[PDB]
Amino acid sequence: GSHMLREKSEKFAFQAEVNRMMKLIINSLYKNKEIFLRELISNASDALDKIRLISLTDENALAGNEELTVKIKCDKEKNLLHVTDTGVGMTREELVKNLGTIGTSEFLNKMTEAQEQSTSELIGQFGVGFYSAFLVADKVIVTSKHNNDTQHIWESDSNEFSVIADPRGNTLGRGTTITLVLKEEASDYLELDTIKNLVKKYSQFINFPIYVWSSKTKTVWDWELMN
């Protein structure tokens, strides 16, 4: 039918607290923007722990994708940064609720009173590092495939968000791809050497293999282990 796209039932507004949280994060870490990559990798790691746990009790947990990895790709031409994990993934309902809504009050006051020291650790602690992606990106896209649902896409420029069934079908198998449309002034993150340095620094203590799609010398491209 056409009733879905004709009723904008895929459009959502963020919860007030999430709006306030995004601002605090953006205003707090304005001087240390590179941490966004650390947070995405951390979230990726957590997603992997979750499916690994589920695989303990569910023999079919890994049916959609046998690997447990984090792969980072730079698309300079497209101005896109991709961080893909083969973790638990998220259902449509989870994309809407986990990303659009949120000890939040305390954290709110904590974050404010934290900007009168630092918020870098607090963000990781409360698990809202995802939103730091907006420090370097104008648009944040989340493509996710959960075992209990079909692949879906969540997109946002921070002023609202939408979730749609992925017309490409199940291409992830299981997992999540965080796609960042980098702000013009954040083009440096499209550089391999830069991403490699950061990835290696923030992946050092991740219990899962983390790869960066890189080139080697003709010139060939392939996954390069960073940790």
Side-chain angles (χ1 to χ4, degrees), residues 1-2 4-5 9-29 33-58 60-65 67-75 78-105 107 111-112 114-115 118-120 122-215 217 219-227:
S2 65
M4 171 168 251
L5 178 146
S9 52
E10 308 168 300
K11 299 291 185 177
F12 304 80
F14 283 95
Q15 156 175 34
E17 287 75 6
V18 182
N19 285 325
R20 292 160 188 157
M21 190 182 286
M22 285 190 267
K23 289 176 176 170
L24 293 165
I25 291 174
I26 293 172
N27 299 314
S28 294
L29 312 170
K33 299 185 182 62
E34 66 185 58
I35 57 79
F36 82 90
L37 188 60
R38 182 188 74 185
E39 295 310 307
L40 290 183
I41 287 181
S42 173
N43 286 335
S45 179
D46 289 354
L48 292 160
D49 284 328
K50 286 175 185 177
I51 191 61
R52 189 179 195 186
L53 276 165
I54 290 169
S55 73
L56 293 179
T57 53
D58 184 347
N60 301 305
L62 306 179
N65 196 315
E67 71 183 55
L68 296 175
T69 65
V70 180
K71 287 170 178 173
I72 297 176
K73 309 158 66 161
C74 291
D75 191 314
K78 267 80 176 174
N79 186 44
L80 305 181
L81 176 56
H82 300 287
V83 175
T84 301
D85 64 70
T86 54
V88 68
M90 286 181 271
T91 65
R92 178 187 170 293
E93 293 71 21
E94 285 177 305
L95 293 170
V96 166
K97 171 185 176 60
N98 291 358
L99 301 187
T101 72
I102 181 63
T104 304
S105 305
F107 180 70
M111 277 291 270
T112 299
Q115 183 176 297
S118 179
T119 63
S120 177
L122 282 172
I123 294 179
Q125 289 188 55
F126 196 60
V128 297
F130 168 73
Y131 301 108
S132 69
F134 283 111
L135 281 163
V136 303
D138 281 323
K139 205 89 176 294
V140 178
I141 304 154
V142 182
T143 302
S144 202
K145 174 63 178 72
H146 183 288
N147 283 340
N148 298 326
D149 206 348
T150 54
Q151 192 163 303
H152 280 74
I153 299 174
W154 176 103
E155 60 86 20
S156 182
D157 67 347
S158 85
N159 299 302
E160 57 164 350
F161 69 83
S162 76
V163 177
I164 63 169
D166 195 329
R168 296 167 297 187
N170 164 30
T171 62
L172 293 177
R174 187 200 61 260
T176 304
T177 286
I178 304 292
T179 300
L180 307 181
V181 184
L182 297 174
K183 291 180 180 297
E184 194 49 50
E185 58 267 48
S187 67
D188 191 26
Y189 294 98
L190 293 173
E191 302 294 312
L192 279 190
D193 54 67
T194 301
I195 289 299
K196 286 190 175 188
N197 275 55
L198 299 179
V199 173
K200 189 173 305 307
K201 170 187 178 183
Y202 299 144
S203 297
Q204 178 161 47
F205 307 113
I206 300 301
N207 294 313
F208 293 104
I210 295 170
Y211 308 94
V212 171
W213 181 254
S214 54
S215 56
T217 301
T219 297
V220 303
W221 289 79
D222 190 44
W223 295 112
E224 188 190 313
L225 182 61
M226 297 301 103
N227 69 332

